[PDB]
Structure formats: structure tokens, C-alpha cells
Amino acid sequence: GHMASVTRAVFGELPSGGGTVEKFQLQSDLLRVDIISWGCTITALEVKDRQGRASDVVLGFAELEGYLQKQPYFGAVIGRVANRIAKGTFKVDGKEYHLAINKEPNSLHGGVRGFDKVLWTPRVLSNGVQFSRISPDGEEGYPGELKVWVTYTLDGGELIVNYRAQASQATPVNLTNHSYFNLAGQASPNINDHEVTIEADTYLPVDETLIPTGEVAPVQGTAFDLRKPVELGKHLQDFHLNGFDHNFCLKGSKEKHFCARVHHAASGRVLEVYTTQPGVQFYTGNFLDGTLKGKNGAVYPKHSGFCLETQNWPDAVNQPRFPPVLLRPGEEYDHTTWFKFSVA
Numbered sequence: 140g141h142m143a144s145v146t147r148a149v150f151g152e153l154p155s156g157g158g159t160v161e162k163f164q165l166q167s168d169l170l171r172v173d174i175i176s177w178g179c180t181i182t183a184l185e186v187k188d189r190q191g192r193a194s195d196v197v198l199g200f201a202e203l204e205g206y207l208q209k210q211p212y213f214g215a216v217i218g219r220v221a222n223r224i225a226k227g228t229f230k231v232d233g234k235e236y237h238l239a240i241n242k243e244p245n246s247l248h249g250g251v252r253g254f255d256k257v258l259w260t261p262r263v264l265s266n267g268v269q270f271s272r273i274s275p276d277g278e279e280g281y282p283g284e285l286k287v288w289v290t291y292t293l294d295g296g297e298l299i300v301n302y303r304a305q306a307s308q309a310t311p312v313n314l315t316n317h318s319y320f321n322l323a324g325q326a327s328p329n330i331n332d333h334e335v336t337i338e339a340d341t342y343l344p345v346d347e348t349l350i351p352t353g354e355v356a357p358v359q360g361t362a363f364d365l366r367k368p369v370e371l372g373k374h375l376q377d378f379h380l381n382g383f384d385h386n387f388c389l390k391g392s393k394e395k396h397f398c399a400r401v402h403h404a405a406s407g408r409v410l411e412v413y414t415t416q417p418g419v420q421f422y423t424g425n426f427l428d429g430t431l432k433g434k435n436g437a438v439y440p441k442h443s444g445f446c447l448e449t450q451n452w453p454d455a456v457n458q459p460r461f462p463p464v465l466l467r468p469g470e471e472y473d474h475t476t477w478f479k480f481s482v483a
């Protein structure tokens with residue numbers, strides 16, 4: 140597994156002279172990863188099957204404009220705080236803060252103009268690229284100036300994403316990457332034939348608005364028990380589930396820990412995920428309605444892709460029994476997620 144080489148090129152130009160967007164291509168002998176400076180968006184991810192055939196296993200667009208249209212956060216970095224915040228409101232050190240209600244009745248994925256929709260500054264690395272941006276105080280209702288660095292590196296079939304941040308004032312922070320995967324290749328219609336395993340003992344049941352109830356429910360005897368590989372379609376069926384969109388609680392320390400494994404027997408592709416995060420959002424692309432103009436004439440229907448957003452638990456800022464989500468001045472936010480690609 141070789142260390143990747145990096146190439147860059149102009150990808151697009153933002154309207155209203157918002158700036159030039161570049162595309163960085165990371166390539167090793169095993170994988171090819173494409174990333175743009177707009178929202179640190181992974182745009183393509185090429186991985187081999189058992190025949191040695193490479194398919195891009197990530198949903199996305201061929202042109203910038205694709206991302207600028209109303210699309211569900213494809214392959215981007217999410218923040219300041221990923222997922223939902225009840226009532227778009229939280230308090231920090233006795234001060235109450237209000238955010239944009241971009242998802243009645245809550246606030247979701249950073250607001251109206253979240254981290255996925257801003258231009259990051261890129262710095263090419265020997266085997267990858269680093270994006271950096273300053274989220275000023277008050278950005279999207281959040282207190283504190285947040286300095287963030289998103290670093291993607293590639294070595295063999297392992298893609299590594301690290302998140303670093305520094306706040307000038309206490310603020311919640313929860314960064315992740317919303318890539319939609321499809322191991323049978325981007326163009327397959329569904330993920331039913333995927334085999335999933337999530338090393339989680341508990342999960343977070345949610346409410347009518349999808350905010351966690353506050354309960355840390357055990358997965359035992361439930362359809363949420365993914366500790367043993369299950370075929371997605373069968374499972375959903377056997378359990379009468381429409382799909383998933385839940386945070387699974389990881390057996391967390393801040394140490395690199397196994398998160399989940401996804402296998403696609405027909406191609407033999409395997410995706411293994413490790414993280415330092417306390418949880419993972421496992422969302423089976425339930426909201427795709429097959430109206431998006433994807434890559435290679437691909438349209439993305441419901442269930443065409445799934446996400447594995449490693450993160451801290453949703454609404455943590457309002458749920459004291461949840462892992463701490465506040466970043467205070469002087470400390471450092473630092474989380475890493477490993478996307479290990481392989482063949483079985």
C-alpha cells in the first residue's frame with residue numbers, strides 16, 4: 140500500500156465572485172480520492188473489487204454547480220455542530236444561544252450556511268491536503284471564533300480524516316463528514332445487499348422530531364443490534380424498519396476504536412471504520428427521493444447510499460448525561476476517523 144501523491148486543478152468558480160474552487164486528487168496504488176476546497180467535500184472515491192476493477196463508491200456531482208444546488212450535504216464536512224439541536228437552542232455558561240431553525244422545529248448540521256457550504260483554504264501535503272478556515276464569533280449563532288483544520292491523508296487503502304479546532308470562547312463543536320457510500324458502486328440503486336456491523340451496545344432512541352429522547356437504550360433484542368453482521372435489506376425487513384438514522388453509542392475512550400464494518404460480497408469490497416468519536420450516525424439515505432442529477436447520469440433514489448458520521452451524540456449540548464460537547468479556550472478539539480478499504 141503506497142503513499143499517495145497529490146495533484147491539484149481548478150474545479151470551479153463561485154458565483155458573486157465567491158472565489159475559485161480547487162480539486163485535489165489523492166492517489167495511491169489502491170485508492171483514488173478527489174476533494175474540493177468547498178466544504179472539504181469528497182467528490183469521488185475510487186476503490187477496487189476482487190477483479191481489481193475500480194468503482195467510485197461515493198455519491199456526488201461532476202461539477203461544482205452540483206453541490207451548489209439543494210442537495211443533502213453530499214460528501215462534505217459538517218459543523219459547527221453536526222446533526223440536530225433541539226429548538227435551535229442551547230445555553231453555555233448560563234448564556235442562552237439561538238440558532239437558525241433550518242429543520243423545524245430544530246437546527247441541523249450547523250445552520251443555513253454550515254461548514255459544508257463555505258470555501259476552505261487548502262494546503263497541499265506530501266501525502267494529502269489540509270483545509271483550514273476561521274468560523275468567526277457569532278457565525279450561525281455560535282459564540283466564539285473557531286479556528287478549524289481538516290486534514291485528509293491517504294496511504295494505501297486507508298483514508299484518514301482529522302479534525303482540529305481552537306475556540307476563543309466556549310462553544311459546542313462536533314465535526315464530521317457526510318459522505319454517502321455505496322460499495323456496489325455509486326451507480327447502484329440500493330444498499331440492501333450490504334452487510335453491516337456496528338460495534339455498539341446502546342443506541343439513542345429519538346422523538347417525533349428526531350431528537351434523542353435522552354434514553355441510552357440497549358440494543359439487545361432490538362432491531363438496533365448490529366454487533367453481528369446483518370444484511371441490511373433482510374434486517375430492515377425482518378424488523379419492519381424503514382431504514383436507520385440513529386446515533387449508535389460507541390464504546391468510547393478517546394482512543395482509536397473500531398466503529399463499523401461494511402461488506403459487499405458481490406464485489407467483495409469492505410469498508411472498515413475506526414474513530415476517536417463517541418458515536419456514529421448511521422443513516423441509510425432515507426430522504427433521497429431520486430431527483431438528484433448525480434455523476435454519470437446516476438440519480439439517487441431512497442436507500443441508494445448510507446452515511447457513517449462519526450461524531451459526538453446529537454443534542455448533547457442539551458443532554459447533560461451525554462458526552463461533553465463544549466470546547467473551551469485553551470483546549471483543543473482533535474478527532475480522527477479512519478476509512479479503511481479492502482477486499483474480502
Ligand SMILES: OC[C@H]1O[C@@H](O)[C@H](O)[C@@H](O)[C@H]1O
Nearest residue numbers: 211212222384420422426448
Ligand atoms: O439528509 C441529511 C441527513 O443527515 C443526517 O446526518 C441526519 O441524521 C438525517 O436525519 C438527515 O438530516
